[PDB]
Design a protein around this ligand. Structure first.
Ligand code: R7I
Ligand code: MG
Ligand code: MG
Length: 327
């Protein structure tokens, strides 16, 4: 049985990764030293709430409010909350494409809430990581893996109609789902994910999960190799496996990151140090780590720095009660 500490951990880990990663997003200059300096400064900051969240968290909050309002899952309700959140705070950092989905949903013209997403990119759909950046809460609300898969897919398909986009969301939901199942050994965790994605894809995501297995079996893998083989990009394929790798890697000491940081801290630091799409890779890695290690590794000095931490903690309690009702 999942603990309150795990649901809280996942949501706070997602918030921290977004808030902390946001400062570096789209840098091909961010290096580990920058991130370590940022963290030391952040811990000494006298004012609370100095880091604002981005679209990653804005959409997360909308997903959560939809699940609480309509716990059997209502994609029409969720689409409306996404569109209305966009309209209310359009500057949070959304992808250039997905804005058009929100505009179409806000218009009177579409009865099918999935149709705007299908029309994206000449009808091929978005392959971006926006479906995955917000999907953790599906795994926190629905214990049954079949529900996690079908609702991750549908939640993603409101904006991301490409199989790369919505399979990336499924993968991220499954990573959170398997992280909730306890002391899970690295090898078991990957076997669980590969098992599910082979069925779902069959294989681009499986191929990357296989590379992850190879990397974890090596030592001192340079950042360059991770970036080159897994990616650090806005495409789901180039970010969701990378977030999973970050989590798995950070289950053990990293030679470049001081051991005074706990595993969840290490995970967020490491994620951000890979550069590229840093808010999204760290929000995804942070969700997984939070689910795994729980709220005991979300420290007071870190969490107080984030916009909407109190609202986030309150929403975790509500999600936990939905999870418990689903049992
Ligand atoms: O099919 C495609 N063809 C061509 N380009 C594609 C395609 N799918 C995604 N993209 C690219 O991926 C981008 C993002 O996808 P989309 O517009 O659907 O938004 P999405 O929400 O996927 O972007 C999420 C990212 O946005 C913020 O950075 C946020 O923090 C996160 O990193 C698009 O603007 C395109 O550059
Ligand atoms: Mg963002
Ligand atoms: Mg991002």
């Amino acid at each position: 049985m999942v603990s309150l500490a795990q649901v809280r951990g996942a949501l706070c880990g997602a918030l921290l990764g977004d808030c902390m990663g946001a400062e570096f997003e789209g840098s091909d200059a961010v290096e580990l030293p920058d991130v370590l300096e940022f963290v030391r400064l952040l811990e000494k900051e006298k004012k609370a709430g100095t880091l604002f969240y981005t679209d990653d968290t804005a959409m997360t909050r909308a997903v959560i409010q939809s699940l609480i309002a309509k716990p059997d899952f209502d994609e029409v309700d969720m689409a409306k909350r996404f569109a209305e959140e966009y309209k209310k705070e359009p500057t949070r950092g959304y992808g250039a494409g997905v804005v058009q989905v929100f505009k179409k949903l806000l218009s009177p013209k579409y009865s099918d809430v999935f149709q705007p997403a299908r029309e994206q990119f000449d009808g091929k759909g978005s392959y971006g990581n926006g479906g995955a950046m917000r999907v953790a809460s599906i795994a926190l609300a629905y214990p049954n893996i079949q529900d996690v898969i079908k609702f991750a897919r549908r939640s993603a398909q409101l904006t991301h109609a490409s199989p790369l986009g919505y399979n990336g969301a499924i993968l991220q939901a499954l990573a959170v789902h398997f992280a909730l199942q306890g002391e899970l050994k690295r090898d078991t965790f990957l076997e669980q994910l590969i098992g599910e994605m082979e069925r779902i894809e069959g294989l681009p995501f499986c191929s990357r999960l296989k590379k992850i297995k190879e990397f974890l079996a090596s030592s001192n893998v340079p950042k360059a190799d991770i970036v080159d083989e897994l990616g650090h990009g806005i495409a789901a394929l180039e970010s969701v496996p990378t977030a999973i790798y970050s989590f798995l890697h950070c289950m053990e000491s990293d030679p470049d990151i001081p051991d005074l940081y706990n595993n969840l801290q290490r995970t967020i630091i490491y994620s951000i140090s890979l550069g590229g799409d840093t808010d999204t890779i760290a929000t995804m890695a942070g969700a997984i780590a939070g689910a795994y290690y729980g709220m005991d590794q979300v420290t007071p000095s870190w969490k107080r720095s984030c916009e909407a931490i109190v609202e986030t903690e309150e929403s975790a309690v509500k999600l936990y009660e939905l999870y418990c009702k689903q049992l």
